[PDB]
């Protein structure tokens, strides 16, 4: 439900296939937050329980409100955060092809740490999804390093934040069925382009 560390406490021995790594949105609990979990069940259902482990950024990531403001649209420590949980993943499982995905503050903090990610580790996600993207405009749609056919962006008519502003209004807490949906669909398609199945 809201907290997933399989990546923290997996087993080197018996590695996924696929890891997710998912960043949550403002002031949201655990550390999946309202979207990540509906995302993990249908990838579950995907590659089975032991076929992919999903993992929240928590730790250092606080998901405070204020950092939306910061120059990155979120802190430098949830980065660093973020930074550490991929390197683990690339020494823990270096067969395992990755996947990613943020909400709001957690789509700017994803953005950031892809974009300083070594590219060897960077090159291994093959699909991420950004909800509610606050750094949409400035990004102009993309993940800075990162090609626009492995990124999908759900950004809302009148979710303000994707339009170049902090402000929150109701279509940015309306995410739920993309969540449920398309973009489950969308990491699924990514990993089996490059796995096959």
């Not at 949105?25 to 937050?33: D, F, H, P, Q, V």
């Not at 991929?86 to 957690?106: E, M």
Request: charged share 20%; with cysteine.
């Amino acid at each position: 439900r809201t907290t997933r560390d399989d990546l923290i406490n997996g087993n080197s021995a018996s590695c996924a296939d696929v890891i997710f790594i998912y960043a949550r949105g403002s002031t949201e609990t655990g550390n999946l937050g309202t979207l990540g979990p509906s995302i993990a069940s249908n990838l579950e259902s995907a590659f089975g329980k032991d076929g992919v482990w999903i993992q929240g950024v928590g730790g250092a990531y606080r998901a405070t409100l204020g950092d939306n403001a910061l120059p990155r649209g979120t802190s430098s420590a949830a980065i660093r955060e973020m930074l550490g949980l991929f390197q683990q993943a690339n020494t823990k499982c270096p067969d395992a092809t990755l996947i990613a995905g943020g909400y709001s503050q957690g789509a700017a903090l994803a953005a950031a740490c892809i974009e300083d990610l070594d590219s060897a580790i960077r090159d291994k996600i093959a699909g991420t999804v950004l909800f509610g993207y606050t750094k949409n405009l400035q990004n102009r749609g993309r993940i800075p390093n990162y090609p626009a056919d492995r990124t999908k962006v759900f950004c809302n008519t009148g979710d303000l934040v994707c339009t170049g502003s902090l402000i929150v209004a109701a279509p940015h807490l309306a995410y739920g069925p993309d969540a449920r949906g398309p973009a489950p669909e969308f990491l699924i398609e990514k990993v089996r382009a490059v796995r096959g199945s």
